[PDB]
Design a protein around this ligand. Structure first.
Ligand SMILES: Nc1ncnc2c([C@@H]3N[C@H](CO)[C@@H](O)[C@H]3O)c[nH]c12
Ligand SMILES: Nc1ncnc2c([C@@H]3N[C@H](CO)[C@@H](O)[C@H]3O)c[nH]c12
Ligand SMILES: [Ca+2]
Ligand SMILES: [Ca+2]
Ligand code: NI
Ligand code: NI
Ligand code: NI
Ligand code: NI
Ligand code: NI
Ligand code: NI
Ligand code: NI
Lengths: 328, 328
């Protein structure tokens, strides 16, 4: 009652924080048996995110013998697209020396054609439904794949979900989608596909834990913390996460306080440490209009939709990330 | 006639290629005795450029016992600043795990106060005038510091320069300065301070070797090459340079063919291997006007100003970069 790992699927969209989330889950096999990953063409170009997922999988398998697992490119399409500039980060990671260790590249090239054949939405449905135990789905991209599963299979899928831990939305704080067509009240993961997020977030048959901006604002990614990885540069996982975070520490300056946060990574951290945040049940009325408020997740004007994460512990997050990135 | 290392100062502005340049020079003590570095607040924020210069110097000193050396922040200011977004690269590098190894960070905090007192321009003049050998000055940022020295000390300075190997200009090809007020004909290093450039490039008392876009267009930083560093991830210098390049391989897509190149690195490569390119003597009419063609370096309607690098060897560049990055 403590020695059995949770079965987990990571449903991501391939930016730096998604892969830090992936590394936190995969680096902790005592707690997490990662049985598959989905990548969506949202905050990455899916082929890049796909390759990076495969090569992280292969490196961890090489170093600490975590299992290999199916990886599937979702064919979900945007309602509203991410800024193209942000979506290149998976290509940069694909080219990094830590993701081009020769043994890792060889194994991934052997495994790629089989994973190529998967459709990511069907894979999420198949992995959950074929799992012996209930599965925790960690969603760090849009909710498009979860919605597709719910629509297609209803309770035959949702009854096999333990919980869905989700990075998305903004409840009692401002959004982070700043465009001439928007009011700034929406968060990006929701904005990408609002109807998907409405279908999932208020589906009565799943437990949704929601790491909204309310909580993710507590963990800015800053230089003074990032420099910490230097002391443990001999570990591949510190090189990876250290580099991933270092690639982002200027964004707060460049965008005038609109920081890069460890959004996805904190979300995944909850799976690893359930006491890192307290939960608050909330009813949500997800805005699916095509006005300026598109994508907003305001409290409904009302039975709870989601358990909203509150007051996350910066210190626990820090200790998990640094301990995890010393694993190998 | 080959066993005596050249005496070199790197006069740079702190971007990823400036540092790959610094690395090619410092990793090859048999060929190059690096006696100083100047950093200008142009394609970086100077405090970041300064720190990264120091920590690279400290890392190489620890690993292969290359000498320490003075480093100074120039007080040169922009006529036309680099795009702000580009300038943050040295902040990202400052935060990288390979540039935060405890021993190197500790040595650099010990040396920083003494280097902080230096004035970049004054340091450049002092080092050249006090050298026993004539000094090859590698310039990979704007020409502001060379122009200051030539102006203040005349022959006192210029007679102590072997040659100035400069990244700048575009002679028979287009520029890379793409702004609402410019015609695309000028190159960034010249455009940052055109009068300084005009003062050095046609200075009758200095040999200038110019790596303009004509040559540098041969060495785009491309994923298929960058992925090679993975095979060398055990060497610190391949982690640095592989990461520096992998941070930039997306730019060719992002700016629709306007690629990231190994501009400054090829410039330094010439100092290491003079047969990497051939030289053509060319008189230049550097444009200092405030219109569309500000910063252009056209052929003049004259005695040679510079010796322009031509048809650089892509293969020799590759072999030198990959050999140098296995040094430690
Ligand atoms: N500036 C930025 N650069 C790259 N990615 C992102 C995101 C992505 N969307 C979620 C948080 O809004 C989280 O899943 C991020 O991966 C938001 N802002 C970003
Ligand atoms: N896109 C870009 N990102 C970052 N830096 C640069 C430069 C800098 N200017 C010179 C080439 O024009 C070279 O010395 C570079 O360091 C040009 N384009 C850049
Ligand atoms: Ca994400
Ligand atoms: Ca430069
Ligand atoms: Ni147990
Ligand atoms: Ni399969
Ligand atoms: Ni710590
Ligand atoms: Ni600003
Ligand atoms: Ni000799
Ligand atoms: Ni001094
Ligand atoms: Ni384009």
């Amino acid at each position: 009652g403590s020695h059995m790992a949770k079965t987990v699927i990571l449903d991501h969209d391939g930016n730096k924080d998604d892969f830090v989330a992936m590394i936190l889950l995969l680096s902790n096999p005592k707690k997490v048996n990662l049985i598959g990953c989905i990548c969506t063409d949202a905050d990455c170009f899916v082929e890049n995110g796909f390759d990076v997922t495969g090569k992280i999988m292969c490196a961890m398998h090489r170093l600490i013998k975590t299992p290999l697992f199916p990886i599937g490119k979702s064919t979900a399409t945007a309602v509203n697209a991410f800024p193209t500039e942000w979506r290149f980060s998976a290509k940069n990671l694909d080219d990094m020396p830590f993701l081009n260790i020769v043994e890792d590249v060889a194994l991934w090239e052997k495994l790629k054609p089989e994973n190529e054949a998967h459709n990511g939405q069907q894979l999420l449905a198949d992995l959950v439904m074929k799992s012996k135990e209930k599965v925790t789905v960690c969603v760090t991209g849009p909710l498009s794949n979860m919605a597709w599963c719910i629509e297609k299979y209803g309770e035959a899928f949702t009854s096999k979900v333990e919980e869905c831990v989700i990075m998305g939305g903004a409840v009692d704080v401002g959004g982070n989608v700043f465009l001439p067509t928007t009011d700034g009240s929406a968060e990006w993961n929701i904005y990408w596909d609002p109807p998907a997020a409405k279908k999932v977030l208020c589906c009565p048959n799943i437990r949704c834990v929601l790491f909204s901006l309310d909580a993710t604002n507590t963990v800015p990614v800053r230089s003074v913390d990032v420099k910490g990885f230097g002391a443990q540069n001999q570990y591949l996982l510190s090189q990876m996460v250290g580099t991933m975070w270092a690639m982002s520490t200027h964004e707060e300056i460049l965008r005038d306080g609109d920081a890069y946060y460890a959004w996805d990574a904190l979300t995944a951290a909850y799976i690893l440490e359930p006491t890192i945040a307290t939960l608050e049940p909330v009813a949500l009325d997800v805005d699916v209009s095509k006005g300026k408020s598109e994508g907003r997740t305001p409290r409904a004007s009302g039975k709870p939709c989601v358990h909203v994460a509150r007051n996350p512990s910066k210190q626990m997050f820090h200790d998990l990330v640094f301990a995890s990135t010393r694993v190998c």
